[PDB]
Amino acid sequence: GKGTPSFGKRHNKSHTLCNRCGRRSFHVQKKTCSSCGYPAAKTRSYNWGAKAKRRHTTGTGRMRYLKHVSRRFKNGFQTGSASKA
Amino acid sequence: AQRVTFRRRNPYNTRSNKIKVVKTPGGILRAQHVKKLATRPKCGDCGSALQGISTLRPRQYATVSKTHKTVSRAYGGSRCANCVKERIIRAFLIEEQKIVKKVVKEQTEAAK
Amino acid sequence: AAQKSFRIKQKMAKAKKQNRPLPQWIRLRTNNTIRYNAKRRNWRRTKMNI
Amino acid sequence: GRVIRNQRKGAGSIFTSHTRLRQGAAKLRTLDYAERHGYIRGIVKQIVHDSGRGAPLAKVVFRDPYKYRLREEIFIANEGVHTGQFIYAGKKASLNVGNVLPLGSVPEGTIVSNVEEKPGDRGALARASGNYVIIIGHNPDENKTRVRLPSGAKKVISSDARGVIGVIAGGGRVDKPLLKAGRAFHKYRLKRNSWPKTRGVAMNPVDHPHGGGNHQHIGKASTISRGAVSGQKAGLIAARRTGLLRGSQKT
RNA sequence: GUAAGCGUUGGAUUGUUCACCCACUAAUAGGGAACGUGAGCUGGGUUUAGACCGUCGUGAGACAGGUUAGUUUUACCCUAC
RNA sequence: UUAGUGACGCGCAUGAAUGGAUUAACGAGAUUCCCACUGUCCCUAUCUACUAUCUAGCGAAACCACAGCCAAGGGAACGGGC
RNA sequence: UCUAGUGCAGAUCUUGGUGGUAGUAGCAAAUAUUCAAAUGAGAACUUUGAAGACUGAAGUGGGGAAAGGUUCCACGUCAACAGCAGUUGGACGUGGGUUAGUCGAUCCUAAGAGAUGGGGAAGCUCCGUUUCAAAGGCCUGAUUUUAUGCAGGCCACCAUCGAAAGGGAAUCCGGUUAAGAUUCCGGAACCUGGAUAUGGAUUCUUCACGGUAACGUAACUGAAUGUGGAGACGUCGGCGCGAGCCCUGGGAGGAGUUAUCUUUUCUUCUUAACAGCUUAUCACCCCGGAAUUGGUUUAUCCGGAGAUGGGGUCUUAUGGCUGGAAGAGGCCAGCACCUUUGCUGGCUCCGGUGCGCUUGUGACGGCCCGUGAAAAUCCACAGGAAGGAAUAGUUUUCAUGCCAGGUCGUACUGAUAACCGCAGCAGGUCUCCAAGGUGAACAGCCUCUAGUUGAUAGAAUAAUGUAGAUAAGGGAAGUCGGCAAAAUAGAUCCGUAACUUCGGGAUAAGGAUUGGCUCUAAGGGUCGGGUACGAUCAACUUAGAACUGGUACGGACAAGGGGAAUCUGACU
RNA sequence: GUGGAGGCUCGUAGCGGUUCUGACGUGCAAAUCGAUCGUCGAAUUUGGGUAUAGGGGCGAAAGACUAAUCGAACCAUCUAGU
RNA sequence: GGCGAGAGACCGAUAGCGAACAAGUACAGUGAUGGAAAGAUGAAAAGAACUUUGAAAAGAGAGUGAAAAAGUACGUGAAAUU
RNA sequence: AAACUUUCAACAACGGAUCUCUUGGUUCUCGCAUCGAUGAAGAACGCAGCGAAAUGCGAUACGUAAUGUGAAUUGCAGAAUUCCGUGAAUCAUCGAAUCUUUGAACGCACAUUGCGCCCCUUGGUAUUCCAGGGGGCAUGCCUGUUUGAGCGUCAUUU
C-alpha cells in the first residue's frame, strides 16, 4: 500500500507561504524558503536556474521606482518646477 | 438515552477535557467540562497533607483569604504540627547540649 | 480549517472575489478579444495550494 | 560501500543519550576552602533512582558559607547511607561512610568511591553500582596515592584528591538474568539507542565488512589493528590474545 | 498373413516423462499431430528476487549438488467449429 | 511405497559458540501416518441470486500493412495471399 | 541571373485530427422498492403523503482535529457535469451569512531549533547557546531652579522560537435565525487589571481573639533575603463511593389497541454556572494504658515509637437543603380568528433496587537492572527593615461600591460526494457520546430515538461464469499435496496418556446431558430486647423432582477437528 | 479457601496479511474485494511536534525504506554527453 | 543585460523568443523545478426588426449586407473520415 | 432485384491544412550610462459609478499636484460649466507629493496581522493603570563629543 492508501495518509503540509516571495515554499521545520532563501539576507538564485531567474527577476513586477529612474536621467535629475510660460 | 458532544473544539480525552454529563432545565443532557482537581498542600518535612488548609488551584489560592491558606501556628501552612514540635524540641535540646560542650571545653582548658 | 490564520483567510477572500464571471459590457467594448474568463476556479476541480 | 552503524553512531541524532528523567549530574561538592582546610556538614535529605543508572543518588544539602543559601548537591549513594544523614566533607573530617575525605587523610586498605583522579573534577572513578577503589599506600613526599581500580588496575593520583568512603549502592544488579528482550528494551529505552544489535555477518557487504557470502561467515579475521580506520574496525580492536580465558590474567 | 473396424484400465511411491510393484482384465500394444494441447487448467519440478546445509574460493561469490517459501494477464475482432 | 520412521556407517563433502548432540513448551514453518469428516473422486445431477441474453438510454479501449476457406508443393527448410 | 532552413510514404518520428473495432465490451458489490397526488412541456429517480425495508448506539446517528475553502442558506435555473434520466443537486447565475473579558491562539516551557560574544572558513556560511565577554534592571525615594538626576539599597538568571491533544485566571440556563452562537437577546455569575469611598475589623497593652490540642474565624501590619508546597504526572488489578444512563412501583395527564383479554402498551413529570448552611474515606488530637493479645481488609496489615475504645478537629472530591428557579422549560385542557394571531387555566409529585453500563474519584495492592517531563504562574512560611494610636489613628488578602477588558479564528463537510488518491474511485485518514432484548459479551440477530431508502432501469430465466447450498452407496481411490469444503463447536458433570525445564501438556484424548411447564430446597438486608426469637423488606444464582412433546431442545445466530511421530527454530 | 501474576492463553474492536495460489485482473482499485487466518495488555497500536539528507541517512538486516522512484532519490545544468 | 534609435536577400502563428492573444499565464508537483494551447466576421454590427411552428433551444420565412457560398460553432475552408 | 460493401462525382458535415495577411520575434549596427538605508528588485493585500484579468496605482489608491496642448472619454450611465477658457481628456510631459503590509528590512519576533520600552499630547477625577493620535528604539564600522575603567602609568600634594 505504498501508493493509494498512503496518499490517503497524506495530509500535513511540509511547506507553507513565505513573506518574501509568496510561493508556498517555506519549510516549517527548517525555517527556509526553497525559492528565495528566506530568512537569509540574499535572494536564492543559480545560473543553472536560468528560467528561475527569468521568472523572479527585475521587470516581472511593478518597478515602482525604476521606470521613473530612466525618465529622470533623461531629464538630468532636475529639481524645482515649471514657470508658466 | 441521549448522547452528547464535547462542548469545545478539542476532541480528545485529555486531562484538561474531562467532561461530566448533566441534566439541564430543558429536560435534556449536556456535557459540562470539569476542571482538574486540586492536590492538597504538603508538609515540606514529612511529605504529608496538612489540615486546616483549603484545597484549590494555585490562583484560587490568590483569590481566597488568609484564613483558608494558613493556621494560627508558627510554620502555619508550610509544615506539619508534629514536625514543628519535633524541631522545637531539637532546637532547645541541642542548644542546651552546645552550652554543655562549651563549659566542658571551658573547664578542661582552664584546668590545663 | 476552522482554526485558521489571517493570511489564509485573506487569500480565501481574494479568491472568492475572483471566482465570478466576466462583465458583459466588457464583452461589448471596442477592440475586445475577451469572450470568457479563464482564471476561473472551482473548489471541486483545482485547489489553491496555500 | 556504505557508512556503517558504528560510524553513524558518532554523529548521533538518534544515538544521543535519553537525558530527560535524570535528576542531574552526580558530582561532588566543589573543592573550595572549607574542604581543603577543615570540614563541613551537610544532610542527606532524600535518596532517589536515577534513570539509566543502576546506582541510586542522594540529594544532599549543604549551606553556603558565603551567603544565606542552601546549595544542594547530588551524590551517588553508598551502601549504608540513609535519609536524614549527616555527611561530613573535608580534610579534618572523620572516617565514616558517606564522608568525602581525601586519600592522604585515609589509611591503607580503605574503601572509597566517586573518586577524583584530578582534584576539582567533582567526581570520577568508582561511580557505578557495587564498585569501589582500594587505597594501597602513599608517597606523601611527592604527594601521591596508589589505588586499585575495579578493572584490577593500579593508578597514582594526588593525595589531595577526594572520594566518598564506602561502596556504591545498587550492588548485585547483574547477578540477575533479565529473561526478556522487553526488560532489555526498557533498560536501553532509558539509556540510549544501542539495542537491538544486528550481526554484520548477517548483513550484506555494503553494510558491514563481515557481511555477505553464501553462508554467515567472516572471511578474514575479526582481530583488527589500532592502526586501522573507521569502517575497518568491526570486531576485536587491537586484541592481544583471544578465545577462552585459560587461567590467570597474569596482570 | 489380410487387417487400425473396435478397444487398450484401476492404483502405492516419485514433480516426473521413464521406471517399479499390487490387482482386475479379453488385452492391459507402440507412436504422431510446433518433442499436440498454459488468452484450456494446474504450477508439483526446473528457472529471478528471501533463506539453510555441504564442498570450493582469501573474499565477494560458484555448484546438471540438495532443501524450503515464492503474482500464470487479455477475446467483445477475422476464420474455423 | 523412489515417500515416512527406526537402525547400520571407511561419511564424494558430518562434527563441536563456522557451535555439536538432545530437548518440554511453542509454530499461518516443512513432512509422513491414523480416526472422524466429507461432491476431491467414482459420476455427475438439481436449486437460488447477480450476470451473460433481449430492450430503452449512455457508451469506451487493446489492436489494425491489406486482409481474412482449405490440402500439398516449393520457398528464409511450418503461407491468408504465390 | 542570385541565394537557401528548398521537394517525404515510412523514422515503435513530432504535433494536431480522424476512423474501423462498435451502437460493441459494458454501466451487475454495499438485502429494496412500490401506490397515488402536486409541479412541470416532459417524471422509474424532484417534493409530499401512505406502505415496505435497512443502518441497529464499535450506527448509513449526533459533534470535532488535520485538510478543504464558502461547498453552508435562500431565490432563480438546466446549455455543459451528476459515465441512464432530471422539473433535482456539493452543478450554473445572483446574493446573504461566521458577533466572545470567560472557547482557543496569544503566555509557559519539552524534545529541540537558533542570533549575540568569540572562534573557523577563499567564501556562500559553519560551531556553539553560557560559552576564555566590562553582556543589567528592581525598588524606597531626594528635591521641591525640576523634571527626574542625585542619596543610597537590591540582586546577577544572563536572547528568542518551539504544543490550537501537554501546563494554564475566569460562563451557565432558556430563547432566537434561511443559514451563527458556551459569542447574539433576556436573566443570573465569575476572573484579571486599575482606581477609590463608606461600612466592618483593630489600637491608649500600639499591629486580633477562642481552643488542653488537633485546629476555628468575616477581617485581624510585615520589606530585603531565604525555605517549602501546589503546578507535577506511569501502568494494571479488584473493592468502595458518587454522577449520568438503564430497570422499576404508585400517582396526575395525553396518545394507542380493545371480536376476546389486558388496574394494560407508549410517553411528560426536568432543574444548569455560581453562592450560602451542611456532609468523607484517609489523616490528626485529648483521656487512657493493651497477652487470656486485640482491631480489621475482598485482598493481612497495624499497635508501649501508645492499639481497641470514648470524645473531638480537618481536607469539601462528592452528594443533600435553600437561593439561582419556575417566572423558564416540558405535558395537557379550554375559548378565540382572513389575520399581527394569541388569551386563560391546571399538573410539573413521592419513591425502590442492582457484582448492571459508561465515566470520575478515593483508599490499598501488584510490576520493574523500566520507579513512570519541564517551565511559567500562584501560595504559604521563617525573618524582622520599616512604618504608624488617642480627641485620634492604622488596616483595604473581610463585605459593598466604580471603570475597562484589546488582536486573530468562529459558517459547513469531516467523508461509499466537500480531505488525498488525475474523479461524485468499494481504497486510505486522529477522535468523543453510545438505549431495550437474547446472550458471558459496545460479538452475531431483532427493535426504539436519529438518519437513509442513495448505487442506470424494465422483460425473460439458455449455455458459461462468480457468490451461495444440497446430494443416495462408497469415503481421499482424487490430487504434487486431503487444496477446497465438511464434520467439530457454547455451557454443566465425569475422565484425562506419554513426556516434562515439574511450571505444563490439557478444552489432551474421550463420553453423557441441555427445551418448556409446575414445584421444592438452599443461599440475604433493616429493625426491635432489665443494668432463644420476632416484624418487615428485596434480589438473582445454584442444585434437584414430577409432567409433557412425532427423542426434540447451545433448535436460528454464534461456535475448536483430533491423535502418533520426524526435520527445523527454543519461546513472545 | 483467599488472592489475582504472566513480553500466559481463547477470542472482539484494533494492528496485520497465511491460504483460497478464490473474485477482479483494458478492475471499485497503478495492490482492491470476499471468506479463511495470525496477534490482541505487550519488543502494543497510533496522531501531532521534533532530529537524521543522497555515496548520505535510517535499517529487530529484506540490499529493505528514503513522497506510486532505490544494488545509491528527485530538480536543473555541464548536455544537442559518446 | 539595461535605456533609447535605425535596419535586414531572416521567421511568418506546428515557423520565429517558451510567450504576435489577460505567457512565465492557466495547469501539475510537498518542493526545488516544470510549463502549454490559443491570431483573422465584415469597409461598417448594419450581429438578423416582424410573422409563424415549437415548452424552449432552434427551425422556416422575412430582412441587413457587395456577399450569410461571410451568421461570433464567423476569411478562404484541403484530406483522412462521413 | 433490393439492402449491404467498395469506387467516382455533386451538395451537406467533421476538421482546420492551403493561400493571403501581421501592433510580434530574431539577428546586425549606432548611441547613453541611470537601482538601493533619502529604504531598492521582488512579494502580499487592496483601489474604479458598473471589472474577474491585463496594464496602472497605494486609504490623497486605473490615480493628486505642477507644465503643455487645447474640448474630449466612450460599452453603458452620468457630468456639463468644463468651452473666445487658470481648461475637457484612460492625453502627452513630469521637476512637488502620497507612497497600505512587507522585503537588504532595521525595536524583539513570525506558520502569531503577536509582544514590548522611551518622548510629546488628549480622554478616562491618574508620573505608575487603560485606550487613542503623533514621533521614535537594529547591527558592524569611521571621525568627533560626553561619561568612564584599569598601581598600565606620570606628576604634584601634605
Residue D143, number of CB atoms within 10 A of its CB: 15
| Of residues B69, B90, B71, the one with CA closest to residue B81 | B71
Contacts of C14 in chain A (CB under 8 A): none
Nucleotides of F under 7 A from a protein CB: 18-19
How far: D70 CA to G395 C1' (Å)? 36
Q: How many residues does chain A have?
A: 85
- C-alpha A32/C-alpha D129 separation (Å) is 48
| Cell output for D141 | 613526599
Give the number of A-C residue pairs with CB atoms closer than 8 Å: 4
C49 to A24: CB separation less than 8 angstroms, yes or no: yes
Enumerate residues 6+ apart whose C-beta is below 8 A from B28: B2
Q: Within an 8 Å CB–CB cutoff, is residue A24 touching chain C?
A: yes
- C-alpha C26/C-alpha D116 separation (Å) is 90
The secondary structure of B26-80 as a DSSP string is TS-EEEEE-PPPP---B-TTT--B-SSS----TTHHHHS-TTTS--SSSSTTTS-
Contacts of A24 in chain C (CB under 8 A): 49-50
Per DSSP, the three-state class of D75 is strand
For D224, the enclosing helix (H) or strand (E) is: strand D223-224
| Cell output for B42 | 504538603
Computed on alpha carbons and rounded to an integer, the radius of gyration of chain A in Å comes to 22
Contact D50, D26 (CB under 8 A): yes
Triad D115, D118, D123: Cα angle to 5°: 35
Q: Within an 8 Å CB–CB cutoff, is residue A17 touching chain C?
A: yes
SS (H, E, C) D136-194: EEEECCCCEEEEEECCCEEEEEECCCECEECCECCCCHHHCCCCCHHHHHHHHHHHCCC
In DSSP terms, D112 is beta-bridged to D133, D165
| Cell output for B1 | 438515552
Q: Could you say which residues 199-218 of protein chain D have a Cβ atom less than 7 A away from any atom in strand E? A: 202, 204-205, 212-217
Q: Within an 8 Å CB–CB cutoff, is residue A55 touching chain C?
A: no
| Cell output for B29 | 443532557
Which experimental method was this entry solved with?
cryo-EM
A24 to C7: CB separation less than 8 angstroms, yes or no: no
Cited resolution, angstroms: 3.1
How far: D176 CA to G479 C1' (Å)? 56
Q: How many residues does chain D have?
A: 251
Strands D39-48 and D57-61: antiparallel
CA torsion sign, A9 to A14 to A16 to A21? negative
